[PDB]
Chains A and B, each alone.
With several copies, the nearest count.
Chain A
Amino acid sequence: KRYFLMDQGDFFVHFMDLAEEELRKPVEDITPPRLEALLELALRMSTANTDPFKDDLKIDLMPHDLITQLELALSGLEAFSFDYIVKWPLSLIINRKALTRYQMLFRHM
Chain B
Amino acid sequence: REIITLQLGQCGNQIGFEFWKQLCAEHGISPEGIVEEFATDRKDVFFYQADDEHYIPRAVLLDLEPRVIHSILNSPYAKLYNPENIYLGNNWASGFSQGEKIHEDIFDIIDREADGSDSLEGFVLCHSIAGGTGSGLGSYLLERLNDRYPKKLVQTYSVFPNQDEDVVVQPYNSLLTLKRLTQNADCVVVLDNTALNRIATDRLHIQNPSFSQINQLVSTIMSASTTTLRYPGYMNNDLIGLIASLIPTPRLHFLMTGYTPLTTDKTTVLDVMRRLLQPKNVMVSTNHCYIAILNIIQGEVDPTQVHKSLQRIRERKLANFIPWGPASIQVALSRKSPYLPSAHRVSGLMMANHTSISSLFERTCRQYDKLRKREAFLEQFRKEDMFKDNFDEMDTSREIVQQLIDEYHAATRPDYISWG
A residues neighboring B (CB under 8 Å): 2, 6-10, 13-14, 17-18, 34, 37-38, 40-41, 44-47, 50
Contacts and interface: CB of A to CB of B under 8 A. Distances in A.
Contacts, number: 43
A34 B312 CA distance: 9
Interface of B: 1, 40-42, 44, 118-119, 232-238, 270, 308, 311-312, 315-316
B237 A41 contact: no
A8 B270 contact: no
Contact of B312 (A8, A41, A50): A41
B40 A50 contact: yes
Contacts of B42: 10, 45-47
A45 B234 contact: no
Contact of B270 (A2, A13, A18, A44): A44
24 contacts: A7-B232, A7-B233, A7-B234, A8-B232, A9-B232, A9-B233, A9-B235, A9-B237, A10-B42, A10-B232, A10-B237, A13-B1, A13-B237, A13-B238, A17-B119, A18-B315, A34-B315, A37-B308, A37-B311, A40-B312, A41-B312, A45-B118, A47-B40, A50-B40
Contacts of A34: 315
A8 B42 CA distance: 11
A37 B1 contact: no
Max chain B C-beta neighbours (<10 A), residue from A10, A37, A44 = A10
Contacts of B311: 37
A6 B235 CA distance: 9
A2 B316 CA distance: 24
A37 B312 contact: yes
B275 to A, nearest CB: 13
Contacts of B238: 13
A37 B305 CA distance: 12
B41 A47 contact: yes
Given A14-B119, A37-B308, A46-B42, 14 more contacts: A8-B232, A9-B232, A9-B235, A9-B237, A10-B232, A10-B237, A13-B238, A17-B119, A37-B315, A38-B315, A41-B312, A41-B316, A45-B118, A47-B42
